Amino acid sequence: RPITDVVFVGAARTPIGSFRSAFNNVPVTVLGREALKGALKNANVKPSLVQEAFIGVVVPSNAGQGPARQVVLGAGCDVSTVVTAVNKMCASGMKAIACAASILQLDLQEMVVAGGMESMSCVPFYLPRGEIPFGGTKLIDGIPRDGLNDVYNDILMGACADKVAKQFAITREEQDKYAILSYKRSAAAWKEGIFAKEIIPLEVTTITVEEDEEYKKVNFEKIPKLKPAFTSEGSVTAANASTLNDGAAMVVMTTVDGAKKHGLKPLARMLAYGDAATHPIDFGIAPASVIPKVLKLAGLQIKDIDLWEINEAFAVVPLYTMKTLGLDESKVNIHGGAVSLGHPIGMSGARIVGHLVHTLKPGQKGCAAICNGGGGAGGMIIEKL
Amino acid sequence: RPITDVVFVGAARTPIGSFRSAFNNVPVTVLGREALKGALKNANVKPSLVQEAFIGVVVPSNAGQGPARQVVLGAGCDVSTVVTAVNKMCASGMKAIACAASILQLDLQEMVVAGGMESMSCVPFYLPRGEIPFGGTKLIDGIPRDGLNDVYNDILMGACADKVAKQFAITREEQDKYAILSYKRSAAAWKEGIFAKEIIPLEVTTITVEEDEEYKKVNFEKIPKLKPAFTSEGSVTAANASTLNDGAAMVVMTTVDGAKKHGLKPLARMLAYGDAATHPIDFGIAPASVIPKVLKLAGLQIKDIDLWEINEAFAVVPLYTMKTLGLDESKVNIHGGAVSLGHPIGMSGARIVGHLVHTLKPGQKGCAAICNGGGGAGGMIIEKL
Amino acid sequence: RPITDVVFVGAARTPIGSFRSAFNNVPVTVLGREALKGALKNANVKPSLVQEAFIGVVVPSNAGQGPARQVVLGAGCDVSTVVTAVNKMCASGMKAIACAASILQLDLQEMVVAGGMESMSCVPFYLPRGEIPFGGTKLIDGIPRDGLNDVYNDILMGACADKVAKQFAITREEQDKYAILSYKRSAAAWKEGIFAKEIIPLEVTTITVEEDEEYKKVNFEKIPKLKPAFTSEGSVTAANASTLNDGAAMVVMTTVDGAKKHGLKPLARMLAYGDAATHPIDFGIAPASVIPKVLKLAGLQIKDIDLWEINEAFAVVPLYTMKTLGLDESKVNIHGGAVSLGHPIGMSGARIVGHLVHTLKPGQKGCAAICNGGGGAGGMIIEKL
Amino acid sequence: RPITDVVFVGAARTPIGSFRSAFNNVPVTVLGREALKGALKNANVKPSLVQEAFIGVVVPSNAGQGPARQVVLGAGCDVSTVVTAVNKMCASGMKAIACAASILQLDLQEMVVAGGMESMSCVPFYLPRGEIPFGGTKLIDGIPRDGLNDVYNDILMGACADKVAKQFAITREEQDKYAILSYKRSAAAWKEGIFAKEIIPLEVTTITVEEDEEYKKVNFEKIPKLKPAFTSEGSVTAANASTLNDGAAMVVMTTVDGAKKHGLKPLARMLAYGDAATHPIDFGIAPASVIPKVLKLAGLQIKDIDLWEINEAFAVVPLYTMKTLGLDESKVNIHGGAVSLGHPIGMSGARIVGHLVHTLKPGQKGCAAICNGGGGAGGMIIEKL
Ligand SMILES: [K+]
Ligand SMILES: [K+]
Ligand SMILES: [K+]
Ligand SMILES: [K+]
């Protein structure tokens, strides 16, 4: 099979909750379940047809055995369904989709779901096993420890972004200008109904969560006045960096033959996927390497892409990527992104792909690129049908 | 490419340490690093040739950001290396190998490493985020919580095995006879040098660990006298169940063309891989379903397999599998298995595949099948060259 | 010296804060310090004249070394000051005053301070020393563990009160009638300025706390509708039981000769003090035994007492005491008590004595009696001067 | 009554266990119970005669409600017994005895027990109430926090002793010579049966503990080679400092009339007791102030004392005291002390007084002086009968 036989037939996501707010105490498995139910309904695919699942999740500590399996069974899929979780840090939700695409292209399965999820609100604290040392010891926060602190440099991802910003002269002012644009684009897209197709609501004990929570949590006048968040002479702030958040996003994928068999409407097809990596501290420049890689795989050029989703881990990252590759900013993150919508780590790679699946006009091509802790980036190109 | 173009060029593993013993306080990333260095040396592949890695690990809590990436960089691979972790519970180390094989068959990479790892000794305890409730709360053990307790039934995997045993009249006495056979087969294999090819030693603080620790921790006379370990009227005991353990196993994989390009000797080729699943409590019968699936994928019958590695999660599992499929016990787990060697959850699926890579005679075919928490099983068939 | 040579020359207290409210995160040592500063100012005694201190405190876990010493030095007393803490559970603040009286009567010191304090809001959770058990363990709440759970019966003090109530036919309706009367008496006393002399304010980061917090936290209409708080068929509820609270109360004591020497005005003199005890579960009836004991020591009869302070651990306790001894309810707890003002365990015994010191008319006699966990009660009689 | 009417009729103690060794996991209440049963047997006083108890204990966190009451009821005393715990840090066990003596001299009771206890092995760790902060927090060790860290200087008691040592030219070599002498004196006293009268054995899970554990844990050749334990340029070491330990010591006290009434033999009588204090960091010089105070109270001079027990918190303390007061070293701590026997904080002040009760010859006078965290010291003088 060619890669273009791989089609997306549904996509859905939860709203993104703010840290310890809308989805406080809601396990990641609930978020995943509801996004997966939503995606299957979007695809008009009964859960019993799903043969295999790949779900990204980065810090599932204390969510119980096999949270990916919990999501799949919770959504009503048969116990015969094959399930795997993946962790490629911030790229997890994209890499899950790639893994699903690979087994479809090899005809190992016909109907597969994939996506990503994270509940950062529910990440626990750790106490190591064994004798608690005389004099006491630290209760470790799983979010920096397993999620956001770079191991090799022992600095937070935002401090790494400061390093990249300084190296490439991406100024505080440029980062804040971009951050404001993201917040404004998020609000405009919500007002215009842009997310209506992809969003499914959740009831939380009772209120209904149906809208991204983060993008209203902003004061434009204060943005240029904020102190650096990560290093004393830094440029990255809480406003121009992504936030801690909760959410899940899922897609339903099959082959052109599977879609015909079940009377399904293909929404998009795969053109290319892949990954690149560089030094851990420089994860922010890795999208600029994965993008030419997946363009070459797709036999495309930069001008052939109608929309870019370059995950906004920090304003630094799309700014670097756009200027280094010569991208048109009016075609990049046009409905906002993680600086204003938030970054549930395992979710975001799946969210941005599912967004392209729904928001591209038929015939248009979209490229998603997402940097990840450790120095990597995932990339993916799709064609809307 | 056909699947048979995928070849194994190296395999290695750490010894398996016993719980809080040989590798006490040794992080999983150290074990994985040493297994990967060993596998690359076994393959005569310099680390800079590795393009991508998939590593299984089930409970990496508090091992820091991206433990799979830590292993790959620790082993001397280039920062350009693409890395992903996978969690399919007990099948993780096998599923990692399958994911590597898929991208090789699609010619998305040429040189890939895969494996699995676990440090159960270093799994922490958890405290949830937010208000500690008045009256106190439980510090949660990550091992049962994220590793070995079935979430749907809220019973341990050993209690699930009790259920399967009673349903299919697999007696205490049969389980104990099988357990004793496993311990004896492990000891004999160690004496006969069977593991010399696959084992790499580790220095720990300063002792050298060069031999599996678990298989000596047994008293045959006491085995029939042990009390049930999981349920009051149960048949599963500490002796006839797998144990908590630490270890890592890795393989190096390429295509027939890659091997030619780099002057490498293929050790084995892929014939088939896949997965099956059933009700979570019945994971013990899932290998009996995946085995016919992968045999069909390879165009083979039971008689065509020379050696079986059916992971010994509990003696129940190989016993069920052998009697249901009509397997010859003299061809099953002939060098011991997880009842006597231990079960570092993320490691075992990679261990048993790497063991077949080294221990099969040229021209022989081996099938590995590994049940996993949640109801699944992974299967794989390879041919020795 | 006769006991009547022992005189009180000052008394003060903090307001009583509600649990995790006004004095949340304010250590017990701050509360103690401010009450002691206040008492010394009330007595017109410069801190440098204080020779010795006894301070009651029941659960000072994590308040640091020698919280009583911290209070005394914090209040400006000389480092030459002798300091001891006492724990007689709920009687601690009274027993401290008794110990001070004893050394004054023996002429071992001339100027002594005494009182009691508790920050229940700041009581920590406990994790035992050593190996955290496989499978996890409970984080223990210090409030029930060291404060309010009876060790011998392994039931809460309120459950003990249920037992006593049932035994002596003290009904739910009688308890609620008494509780309402306490809440109304507390509000009336506050309105009438009754506490103005004894109260000192605290600034907390900034707001000024100057009024007891608990007595407004009531709904009279709901009181008869509440469910039992401690046992399924019980009579004790949250409304007719004392609450968890924060506060400190201190007195300054000397001899008649010391008062003359320093030009001080005696506010009251000691007539008797002592203790009684019975079975732990029956602590509620112990005040009825200590009262005749201290009357006999003072050579007095019940009719000679103008005001009674019978600590309101539960409405059960003053109800039992009044009916069994034939006390006039119009002379008992006339300005409210712990059911409506709260029960910071180590404080209350000192609070009720200091209240009598200020509120008795000159020449009147007051008797304070306070039951304590373990089965005890303290008693004290004073004469206003 | 004169103070000399107060008599000791019995004394006993547990052996002192080493940290997490002989009495590991044995609660302080068990140690206190056995010491109290032993003291009552030594006195030939049936438990039902005991009217009141004062028991020292410094860090009873997680030992449950009213550990002093638990000890008294555990020893078989009647529920009518009045019980109080006291905390004067290291002086607690002595101050308890003083409080008992005061109420006997005032004829408020006739038969009273007093002592001190500590299980440092069972001291827990603390987690504060309320929100665990983002990023984690420290699990606090109760031993330094509530027992051995000076709050004002935020340094350990051993570092305070370094300061006193340097100020007064008490050298490392002098401290080590004194330490060695203590270890040798402890061993010799054990061999000569000196402790046979005061010791009572305990059964622990099943071994019998009948001898002090600490004084054998020494290597004389290594003592001059140890590194400073508290400050980089310090003189105090693990060997010449007291250790962490578990134990309890109790006495039985009455009046001359009480002894006659019950047919008891007075062992010793009280001559004086009291306390002094100075700056917290200088607790090591406080015994040199309390000793002249209690000598004056007794109408005695230094030459009138036959044996001194100056608690060996650090070798610094008896060295300072002896050279400042001109004491004969051959009359000081002649059977060892806390440097070699250990320092269960709440116990030691009672241990050294009970030791004088048994080891003084009839007609001899003994003075005990014990420094305490916070800057204090307790003193006591008794006369053997
Ligand atoms: K932001
Ligand atoms: K076993
Ligand atoms: K109340
Ligand atoms: K020592």
Tab-separated table of N, CA and C in Angstrom, chain A residues 264-322:
chain	number	residue	atom	x	y	z
A	264	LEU	N	-17.818	4.719	4.929
A	264	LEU	CA	-17.287	5.892	5.628
A	264	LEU	C	-16.779	6.972	4.679
A	265	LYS	N	-16.862	8.225	5.131
A	265	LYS	CA	-16.327	9.358	4.380
A	265	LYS	C	-14.904	9.704	4.833
A	266	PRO	N	-13.905	9.499	3.960
A	266	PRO	CA	-12.547	9.953	4.290
A	266	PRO	C	-12.512	11.461	4.472
A	267	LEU	N	-11.942	11.907	5.590
A	267	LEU	CA	-11.770	13.336	5.848
A	267	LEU	C	-10.434	13.856	5.370
A	268	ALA	N	-9.416	13.010	5.393
A	268	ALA	CA	-8.080	13.411	4.994
A	268	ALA	C	-7.264	12.167	4.752
A	269	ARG	N	-6.174	12.304	4.022
A	269	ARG	CA	-5.251	11.200	3.877
A	269	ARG	C	-3.835	11.604	4.246
A	270	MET	N	-3.084	10.613	4.700
A	270	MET	CA	-1.693	10.788	5.046
A	270	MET	C	-0.805	10.984	3.840
A	271	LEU	N	0.063	11.997	3.892
A	271	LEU	CA	1.117	12.167	2.887
A	271	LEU	C	2.534	11.842	3.373
A	272	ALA	N	2.826	12.100	4.651
A	272	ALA	CA	4.151	11.841	5.201
A	272	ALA	C	4.142	11.986	6.709
A	273	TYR	N	5.038	11.257	7.362
A	273	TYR	CA	5.279	11.465	8.785
A	273	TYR	C	6.715	11.076	9.083
A	274	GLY	N	7.251	11.618	10.163
A	274	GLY	CA	8.609	11.324	10.560
A	274	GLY	C	9.025	12.126	11.764
A	275	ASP	N	10.319	12.083	12.068
A	275	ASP	CA	10.862	12.703	13.269
A	275	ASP	C	12.283	13.141	12.982
A	276	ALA	N	12.733	14.154	13.715
A	276	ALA	CA	14.135	14.540	13.752
A	276	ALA	C	14.516	14.867	15.197
A	277	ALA	N	15.797	15.037	15.465
A	277	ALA	CA	16.244	15.354	16.808
A	277	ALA	C	17.577	16.060	16.785
A	278	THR	N	17.820	16.807	17.847
A	278	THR	CA	19.090	17.473	18.036
A	278	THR	C	19.416	17.481	19.535
A	279	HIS	N	20.401	18.278	19.940
A	279	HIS	CA	20.786	18.371	21.338
A	279	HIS	C	19.597	18.711	22.218
A	280	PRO	N	19.469	18.028	23.367
A	280	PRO	CA	18.323	18.262	24.252
A	280	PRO	C	17.986	19.733	24.505
A	281	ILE	N	18.978	20.573	24.759
A	281	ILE	CA	18.688	21.968	25.101
A	281	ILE	C	18.093	22.728	23.904
A	282	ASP	N	18.340	22.214	22.703
A	282	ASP	CA	17.938	22.846	21.451
A	282	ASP	C	16.670	22.209	20.850
A	283	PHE	N	15.834	21.559	21.666
A	283	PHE	CA	14.590	21.004	21.121
A	283	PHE	C	13.796	22.047	20.311
A	284	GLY	N	13.910	23.311	20.687
A	284	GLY	CA	13.194	24.380	20.016
A	284	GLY	C	13.526	24.534	18.542
A	285	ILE	N	14.700	24.070	18.102
A	285	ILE	CA	15.032	24.174	16.688
A	285	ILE	C	14.767	22.888	15.917
A	286	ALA	N	14.326	21.838	16.615
A	286	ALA	CA	14.112	20.565	15.935
A	286	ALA	C	12.952	20.560	14.907
A	287	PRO	N	11.856	21.313	15.140
A	287	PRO	CA	10.828	21.402	14.086
A	287	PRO	C	11.367	21.888	12.726
A	288	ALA	N	12.329	22.810	12.743
A	288	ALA	CA	12.928	23.306	11.504
A	288	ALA	C	13.707	22.231	10.756
A	289	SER	N	14.095	21.151	11.440
A	289	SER	CA	14.723	20.010	10.774
A	289	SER	C	13.713	18.949	10.350
A	290	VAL	N	12.665	18.719	11.141
A	290	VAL	CA	11.736	17.675	10.747
A	290	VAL	C	10.892	18.132	9.561
A	291	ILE	N	10.642	19.430	9.443
A	291	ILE	CA	9.780	19.900	8.368
A	291	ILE	C	10.370	19.587	6.968
A	292	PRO	N	11.631	19.963	6.699
A	292	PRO	CA	12.178	19.566	5.390
A	292	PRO	C	12.189	18.049	5.189
A	293	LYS	N	12.356	17.291	6.270
A	293	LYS	CA	12.353	15.834	6.170
A	293	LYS	C	11.004	15.317	5.682
A	294	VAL	N	9.907	15.774	6.277
A	294	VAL	CA	8.615	15.240	5.864
A	294	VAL	C	8.154	15.855	4.528
A	295	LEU	N	8.543	17.095	4.220
A	295	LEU	CA	8.303	17.624	2.865
A	295	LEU	C	8.930	16.736	1.795
A	296	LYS	N	10.186	16.355	1.995
A	296	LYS	CA	10.877	15.491	1.029
A	296	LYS	C	10.154	14.148	0.915
A	297	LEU	N	9.739	13.572	2.041
A	297	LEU	CA	9.000	12.313	1.995
A	297	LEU	C	7.698	12.427	1.210
A	298	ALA	N	7.064	13.592	1.279
A	298	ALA	CA	5.807	13.819	0.587
A	298	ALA	C	6.004	14.323	-0.852
A	299	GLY	N	7.246	14.587	-1.227
A	299	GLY	CA	7.556	15.192	-2.524
A	299	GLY	C	6.996	16.590	-2.672
A	300	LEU	N	7.011	17.347	-1.577
A	300	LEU	CA	6.465	18.698	-1.556
A	300	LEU	C	7.510	19.740	-1.200
A	301	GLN	N	7.142	20.983	-1.468
A	301	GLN	CA	7.927	22.140	-1.068
A	301	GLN	C	7.125	22.958	-0.066
A	302	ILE	N	7.810	23.861	0.632
A	302	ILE	CA	7.170	24.762	1.572
A	302	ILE	C	5.947	25.451	0.959
A	303	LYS	N	6.037	25.899	-0.296
A	303	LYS	CA	4.910	26.610	-0.904
A	303	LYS	C	3.652	25.757	-1.087
A	304	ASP	N	3.800	24.433	-1.045
A	304	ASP	CA	2.677	23.515	-1.229
A	304	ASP	C	1.796	23.357	0.022
A	305	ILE	N	2.278	23.848	1.166
A	305	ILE	CA	1.540	23.733	2.418
A	305	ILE	C	0.624	24.939	2.619
A	306	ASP	N	-0.651	24.655	2.806
A	306	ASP	CA	-1.650	25.690	3.003
A	306	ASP	C	-1.734	26.171	4.451
A	307	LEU	N	-1.580	25.241	5.397
A	307	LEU	CA	-1.620	25.572	6.821
A	307	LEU	C	-0.533	24.807	7.557
A	308	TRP	N	0.118	25.517	8.471
A	308	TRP	CA	1.107	24.975	9.386
A	308	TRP	C	0.574	24.993	10.810
A	309	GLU	N	0.794	23.882	11.509
A	309	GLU	CA	0.587	23.800	12.954
A	309	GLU	C	1.955	23.490	13.562
A	310	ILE	N	2.614	24.521	14.088
A	310	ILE	CA	3.918	24.379	14.708
A	310	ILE	C	3.687	24.589	16.189
A	311	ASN	N	3.730	23.507	16.959
A	311	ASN	CA	3.243	23.584	18.329
A	311	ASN	C	3.947	24.684	19.101
A	312	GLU	N	3.143	25.486	19.784
A	312	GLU	CA	3.629	26.661	20.495
A	312	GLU	C	4.115	26.304	21.902
A	313	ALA	N	5.132	25.449	22.004
A	313	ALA	CA	5.667	25.107	23.325
A	313	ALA	C	6.041	26.394	24.055
A	314	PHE	N	6.656	27.292	23.282
A	314	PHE	CA	7.042	28.653	23.672
A	314	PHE	C	6.907	29.482	22.419
A	315	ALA	N	6.641	30.785	22.539
A	315	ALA	CA	6.629	31.635	21.364
A	315	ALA	C	7.932	31.496	20.568
A	316	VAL	N	9.033	31.270	21.280
A	316	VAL	CA	10.335	31.036	20.651
A	316	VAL	C	10.259	30.034	19.490
A	317	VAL	N	9.493	28.952	19.657
A	317	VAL	CA	9.596	27.845	18.700
A	317	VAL	C	8.975	28.175	17.338
A	318	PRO	N	7.716	28.658	17.286
A	318	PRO	CA	7.247	29.066	15.957
A	318	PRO	C	8.030	30.239	15.386
A	319	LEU	N	8.484	31.162	16.227
A	319	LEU	CA	9.278	32.273	15.717
A	319	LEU	C	10.553	31.771	15.054
A	320	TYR	N	11.279	30.872	15.711
A	320	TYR	CA	12.493	30.350	15.101
A	320	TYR	C	12.190	29.615	13.799
A	321	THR	N	11.160	28.780	13.844
A	321	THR	CA	10.848	27.924	12.723
A	321	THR	C	10.444	28.764	11.505
A	322	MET	N	9.585	29.746	11.738
A	322	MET	CA	9.080	30.572	10.646
A	322	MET	C	10.226	31.349	10.007
